[PDB]
Assembly symmetry: D2
Homo-oligomer: 333 residues x 4
């Protein structure tokens, strides 16, 4: 069994534990956060958007017992100091939001873990994997990898189909995204100086940057430098979508685009034809859910603008992609 | 000028229209019509969950409300043909119910004795459609029914007009991220218009929905006829919206030149913003559209450019002020 | 033979009742009636913003929905007198429209051929009112129309019944902090029934509103007739509520004694909670009422005691489960 | 001449305090201190998601903001003893950070050279605690550190004082249905203070939580010492709250006697309401407490009565106005 430690027992970290409990041959030996075990256990059991944990979870001294198995709990904010080698940790899921580059994530390796998966973009010098698009770039010799962002896992399969079947000249993305924990509850100073994330999360449409489109070349080299975009955070607590407006290399119709997406569907990339809304993707296990109902092709003379839209639960969709990537990576190491 | 106005549909737009007309010279509201007793209309005029308390005096008088000392008759007749507009001497009806949005239905107010109608929505192809600050000069005063377009059209049109005038537009796709409105259900339930997405709980969901603002832009800007399309995402803010436009232009551009052109085009109708604002910051603004220079993007790949421009609007108050500006301009010509 | 149910009003309660009846053995919904095309009802049944996606299959056919492989007829007649209940062999109608909540109106279903009706709301003076787990034994089977009370009554009654049996209640005042419901407007607008407070935007406001649940408690617990009163505060959660009761008891009490008495009375209808939960944690629960022992207070000042007790309920699913329990018991008698 | 004030903690309360002091004659803010660059503080002062745009001018300068043409110094020192209050001639510090809410910690501002401090929160049992309009007469100006109590105390106290004065209170249990605040998390996450309920997503949940407002009421109304307790239910409105009190009184009472007594006690601090209002209607009000006569209830069973009284408050702006009234009164006691 591959032993996992979760660093940062937050939204992604706790959902990752839920998904890993369902995965054979991989188990979480430890979690680390900033708080006593009682707090972590409570938040694991009870979840405002993802529902009650559907298993048993009990408290023990400096440990939680999940489905009858003990998971040690630590509270050390500095990863290099954690007893990963001493516990026999194979892979750390780095989910704190504070160690999202190679140099910082490698602290887990100095602590004795064999591998790290960052639950976020990790820079250009770590292999970046959207499961179902480019996991074959891993051979197991990597030490630190990235599972990209939630938006990258939504955008990439949609962009891959467009590039493969039509060719992409260029594109601009907008993700309409659930608010997240990096926004304030009420208007207040923001630690990272972001005047827009400073604002009350559940009261506002909040423009904000995202690198998901700009960095797409790490996942789909044929799209390198061809896409850009940004985000609008809105008052849903989870559930998001990505719109892509593209110029393609050949003419296209709505029906041809939709058929190509359906033909590419998989456990990671779903295909939808129902008139759904964001609450309907909460808890889905696709990394991306293409919505054929929103496809649009604007034609003026010989020039076309193409809109394609995919949903994602930025929490659970990304988490399932993260665990698929971890499982594949763990088979290679 | 001196013109007596009646408001048909004392809803979000109708009530804010009264607030703005109370501030406008030469225009007075003589009557409102809705489906409810005067006490309910008075209460909703005084107290407003998003736009704040009415900053004037408002009192109940039998089947009338007294606003800033002046009596406004209240009617509750769902059939506009039966309203006593001729007997009250109404010059212009603001048609704000959502149920009479074409020339034939709005003309019921004329048969009822009013001289003119302004529809607070798109009004069909045989009705002039005016975005104040873009094309009010098409009005000569002889029209009987006009439209002030939609909230989204009033946001989009000044921004698209600048791009067309200064750069030329090949084509473009619009997305408006829009506050939820009264046509969505409070909780998941059957929807009278059959819309499976507006059936869903308004304050819990990102809700895709159609909009005709881009497709119909040619009624306001003829040079853009057939060049734009788009759609909407309704989201859980109770008012306050923005419109994104992704365009192909006829000449190269930088964000700085785009922003400068928008600033040079600014007016009381079309504002220019450089602050890092969010939707709550546009609630209650009186611009029809507020261009956000901080969101402009120009993507260039092999000399081929995609341009994103974004403008905010309070779909309630921005639109209402545009409606009242269009009303004043029209009323000066009748 | 299967007890055949028809649901009149395929709304929040009606659709969740179908979900629960599909899980109930020996009970099946033969038909639903509303004001709506089958395609829209099917869509609302499958996708639910607060209760989640329907777990099962649901497909469209002409004038029917097929749920778990079984056909359910859909009608659209606003006049219950004209519904074909006798022709379908309907045993019990769940009257969930909100418009036919007294004996005279609900009897339209009996003239239409149904044997019995359960109103999903208070039902007026000619109707027995049943909170399952408190007073179902008042039924003798000769009734044609009964009421399963209100959501708040099913929350309050088991808690109040324990206090009365073990301590005696002199008097009490209730406040229910209640999820907003479909009788409030989305944004400020005229309210058809003239309620100046329910006219206001539901998700933006604390909204005081009247409720007769406490004052009418004597219909369920006769010994409390005339002893309780209270009101509601509607707040911006889309489902999930709680009932606070401030009572004067006839004998001295401690927090521990009250909590133990509630636990000793727990059942499938009345749950007992000791965790620090919040409203999202009761979304979808199947208890009619969930006593929250963490909120019990007994204040003693100069030999006089005032007691606060609090129970949670999902006004949607808690009530729906109580309604179905009452339906099963009533149909067995 | 103006009383010179410094604001420590430029948060919800701190920023609204500056707004109110800018409107008050004879009081001015010389400096604010927080943990952030001036550009962030200016932005948050200008734009407010619940209280609206600042109705003045506000511009940035080097380590200063200029508000209505007057420069206000900005510091970013987390240690209050090091602030240059003596050097600026500060008369009163508003301590609004939440981190220095007792006598020993708040006295850091006195050691730093300020003459007086008002803590914007309960400050413990050894500091005088003032609800303006109830007990400001306990101050004679020789104090250095006082407390303006909590938002809930300023709501509860005027209502409870009337009941005690006119009827006598045996005991009572309070529930405040309270807007969520910044001490709750945006989404479920570990909470620094170990509160399993404030850990949960603020805008998705009814959140039970403790409050000391009723238990400490004796600091404000000594005759009620030990007679009240209560708790809070935090709910998804971003500001605007109400307090329910269920009381056992020393003599029989009717709804009319209670309501008439509240109206007779009304003032700039304690409002009297008879309209069917909801929480959004009290956002930005300047009363410390707004009694709601429509919610009064007296239940009688035999000779035993239970009395329910309810008052609204904007936990932000109502309390801020009380804080500034207390500041003004205290600074005048020379
Ligand atoms: N939430 C989403 O939609 C989402 C989607 C994809 C990726 N991500 C990424 O996942 C990461 C986590 O995001 P989240 O939403 O789970 O945030 P979160 O704030 O819910 O979780 C972060 C957790 O890390 C803990 N933590 C912080 N610093 C720590 C330290 N030094 N040592 C140990 N624990 C520490 C916090 O206590 C918290 O529990 C970020 O990189 C984020 O960008 C988030
Ligand atoms: N809300 C916005 O963002 C917005 C912006 C621009 C335009 N509009 C347009 O303005 C119109 C009104 O929208 P709203 O948001 O004010 O809706 P609303 O539902 O708040 O107001 C409509 C009012 O009309 C009344 N009404 C309905 N039928 C009536 C009849 N037959 N006779 C009299 N009164 C009747 C209703 O009682 C209600 O008070 C619609 O056409 C809408 O498209 C709305
Ligand atoms: N939602 C709750 O929390 C809750 C809890 C307990 C009881 N109730 C009660 O249950 C009833 C329904 O409440 P809801 O929240 O489900 O309301 P809802 O508005 O969601 O559903 C009512 C349904 O009845 C339909 N309908 C209306 N008139 C009809 C007619 N003449 N014939 C057939 N169908 C018709 C509507 O189209 C709608 O689908 C009410 O009596 C309510 O008080 C609701
Ligand atoms: N918000 C309310 O409803 C309300 C009502 C009454 C009283 N209060 C009380 O007022 C205080 C502030 O509450 P708030 O809601 O404004 O909180 P807030 O978090 O919005 O503001 C506190 C500010 O203090 C700053 N700060 C923190 N530590 C600091 C330090 N060491 N030095 C300088 N600045 C520091 C923070 O950056 C923040 O800007 C608390 O005591 C609170 O209990 C709040
Ligand atoms: O603390 C919150 C996390 O950083 C989540 O924010 P993100 O998913 O936007 O990076
Ligand atoms: O009832 C609500 C009105 O019809 C507003 O809806 P709309 O502005 O989306 O048309
Ligand atoms: O649609 C509205 C119904 O009457 C449900 O609301 P209620 O449960 O508050 O009666
Ligand atoms: O961080 C925010 C404030 O400390 C809120 O504190 P409060 O909830 O006690 O007002
Ligand atoms: Cl004195
Ligand atoms: Na496992
Ligand atoms: Na006027
Ligand atoms: Na069944
Ligand atoms: Na001043």
């Amino acid at each position: 069994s591959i032993k996992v430690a979760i660093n940062g027992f937050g939204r992604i970290g706790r959902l990752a534990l839920r998904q890993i409990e369902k995965a054979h041959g991989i188990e979480v030996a430890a979690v680390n956060d900033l708080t006593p075990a009682e707090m972590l256990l409570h938040l694991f059991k009870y979840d405002s958007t993802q529902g009650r944990f559907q298993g048993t979870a009990e408290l023990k001294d400096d440990a939680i017992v999940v489905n009858g198995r003990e998971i040690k709990v630590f509270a050390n904010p500095n990863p290099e100091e954690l007893p990963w080698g001493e516990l026999g940790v194979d892979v750390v899921l780095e989910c704190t939001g504070f160690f999202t580059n190679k140099t910082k994530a490698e602290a887990h390796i100095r602590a004795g873990a064999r591998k790290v998966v960052i639950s976020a973009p990790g820079g250009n010098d770590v292999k970046t994997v959207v499961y179902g698009v480019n996991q074959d770039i891993l051979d197991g010799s990597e030490t630190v990898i990235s599972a990209a962002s939630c938006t990258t896992n939504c955008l990439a399969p949609m962009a891959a189909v467009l590039q493969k079947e039509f060719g992409v000249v260029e594109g601009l993305m907008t993700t309409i995204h659930a608010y997240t924990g990096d926004q304030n509850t009420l208007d207040a100073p923001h630690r990272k100086g972001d005047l827009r994330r400073a604002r009350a999360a559940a009261l506002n449409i909040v423009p904000n940057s995202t690198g998901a489109a700009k960095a797409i070349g790490l996942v789909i080299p044929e799209l390198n430098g061809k896409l850009d975009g940004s985000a609008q955070r809105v008052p849903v607590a989870t559930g998001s979508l990505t719109e892509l407006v593209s110029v393609l290399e050949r003419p296209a119709t709505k029906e041809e685009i939709n058929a190509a997406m359906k033909a590419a569907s998989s456990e990671s990339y779903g295909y939808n034809e129902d008139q759904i809304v964001s609450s309907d993707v909460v808890g889905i296990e696709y990394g991306s859910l293409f919505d054929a109902t929103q496809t649009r092709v604007m034609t003026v003379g010989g020039k076309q603008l193409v809109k394609t839209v995919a949903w994602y639960d930025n929490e659970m969709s990304y988490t399932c992609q993260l665990v698929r990537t971890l499982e594949y990576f763990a088979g290679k190491i």
